[PDB]
Design a protein around this ligand. Structure first.
Ligand SMILES: O=c1ccn([C@@H]2O[C@H](COP(=O)(O)OP(=O)(O)O[C@H]3O[C@H](CO)[C@H](O)[C@@H](O)[C@H]3O)[C@@H](O)[C@H]2O)c(=O)[nH]1
Ligand SMILES: [Mg+2]
Length: 272
């Protein structure tokens, strides 16, 4: 086997993405036979240098997940990546903590395979063009740059939410993501600040290839806007050394391998 081509030849470009067609995971699996237990896939006809762990923060979003799986697996295989899907499920009914869930995902995934790239994706975001590769780059990568919920515009140049990817070393170099952001908002801005403070820039696909669709939904109870988010992101400089991968604590309650993804239910504590 030889190293895969820089740009995969199975790419079709823009795709039709819609969510009023409720799916069947059984069909998904039948339609994606190369997907090994736990949502794992390795190209059989070339060597991909991208060992990608896709981490999805999760809590009561099965319907979104189904659509996510229906759409990304065929896409990811055409992108010729050697990947695994990790749904990090917050146990309990306390305040949601997206970023801490993403950290847990980084550590747990590494216990399965030697991934060197991490794609952090909201459960409700689907790329509209398979040319927007779900891999890592020389600089941190903002993948969902043109979301339809933002009329295909970046809400602001430093926006880093939705879907992003960090090589294993870029992630480590910033001490991971913060574990101290409970509730909705700001966590993505803190992460951006970290990348900046570490002297890194953000890489992005053009607005066309980066178009992506957001599954319309209402606010979830227990993930209400975090009023402390403004003060927190204003002090990332002072807190990233101690709040991160080095101070991460959690309790894996269960690991389930579904045919299309691995579900890790974890207890990540409460607002300290
Ligand atoms: O009860 C919940 C709350 C959140 N999530 C997960 O966390 C993600 C973000 O939560 P929401 O989609 O409600 O939030 P938004 O659509 O506003 O998400 C946007 O703003 C967020 C504020 O924290 C994140 O920064 C972000 O990635 C961005 O896409 C979801 O995609 C999902 O993966 C759940 O599974 N269950
Ligand atoms: Mg959303």
């Amino acid at each position: 086997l030889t190293a895969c081509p820089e740009e995969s030849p199975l790419l079709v470009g823009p795709m039709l993405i819609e969510f009023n067609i409720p799916v069947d995971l059984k069909l998904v699996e039948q339609q994606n036979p190369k997907v090994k237990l736990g949502g794992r896939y390795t190209p059989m006809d070339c060597i991909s240098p991208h060992k990608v762990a896709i981490i999805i923060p999760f809590r009561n979003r099965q319907e979104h997940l189904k659509y996510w799986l229906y759409y990304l697996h065929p896409i990811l295989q055409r992108q010729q990546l050697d990947y695994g899907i990790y749904v990090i499920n917050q146990a309990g009914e306390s305040m949601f903590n997206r970023a801490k869930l993403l950290n847990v995902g980084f550590k747990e995934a590494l216990k399965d395979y030697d991934y060197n790239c991490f794609v952090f994706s909201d459960v409700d975001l689907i790329p509209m063009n398979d040319h927007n590769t779900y891999r890592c780059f020389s600089q941190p990568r903002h993948i969902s740059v043109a979301m339809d919920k933002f009329g295909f515009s970046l809400p602001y140049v430093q926006y880093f939410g939705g879907v992003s990817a960090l090589s294993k070393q870029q992630f480590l170099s910033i001490n991971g993501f913060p574990n101290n952001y409970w509730g909705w908002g700001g966590e993505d801005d803190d992460i951006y600040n970290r990348l900046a403070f570490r002297g890194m820039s953000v890489s992005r696909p053009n607005a066309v290839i980066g178009k992506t669709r957001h599954i319309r939904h209402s606010r979830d109870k227990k993930n209400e806007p975090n009023p402390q988010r403004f003060d927190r992101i204003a002090h990332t400089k002072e807190t990233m050394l101690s709040d991160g991968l080095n101070s991460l604590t959690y309790m894996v309650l269960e690991v389930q391998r579904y045919p299309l993804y691995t579900k890790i239910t974890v207890d990540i504590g409460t607002p300290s």
